[PDB]
Symmetry: none
Subunit: 77 residues, 4 copies
């Protein structure tokens, strides 16, 4: 019935935010549609999605690491 | 840069700090975002939310959810 | 000038001086770097690490382990 | 899963002593963790392909310092 809702901001908004918007469609097609699943990505998943440039992998891996720290912060609730 | 995410109505309630109403939502049958996105004040009163501040918080969070769903469909 | 090799989850805990949690990890099923590299704070708490200093040490060490796995996959 | 056996890789060790041209020779021979590199002797450095005297010396004095460092942490 309605669009999935899993976070206040969308994965797309995040990719646009860090200037990685060129990967929106790659990420979606591959099912990495929520921060919950993006926060578990490793280099091999980013490669599979199609991020081959080192600078872009570093940027996306850095955001994934911030997502995990923020999640670990809340969990220490 | 807020990466807060949730997979269920319970976690969404904990994310907007309204976790005290988890069981009342679940008991009344509000278990999916499909239905939570359509809730009005009457439903909010039906599950026991009586503080004005909590009622606004939950309704504004429903409105924010609807806006997100509505861009998506766009 | 740090040549800390280690082949087991137990050896890694001892290397980072968190040997006191060796059994806890084991009894909860955290027996391979493959699952340890995926641990979050809920897992750290499940294996009984309550001190904030230990929690940070372990999580940062996991953060460092993932980065190395990520390089190698590069 | 890229098997984790240290906070540092043998590869970074080799680059640090400017012996990086031997990275893949070390990897192929399975000299991929420090506890194994710390046990290499001249015959292992030769099997790997290091033939220049200066490089053998650099790599062996380095392995010697590594053992001295492991032997202290062991005390």
């Amino acid at each position: 019935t309605r669009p999935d809702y899993t976070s206040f901001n969308t994965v797309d908004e995040w990719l646009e935010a860090i200037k990685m918007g060129q990967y929106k469609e790659s990420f979606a097609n591959a099912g990495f549609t929520s921060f919950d699943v993006v926060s578990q990505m490793m280099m091999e998943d980013i490669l599979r999605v199609g991020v081959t440039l080192a600078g872009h992998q570093k940027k996306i891996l850095n955001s994934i690491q911030v997502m995990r720290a923020q999640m670990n912060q809340i969990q220490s609730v």
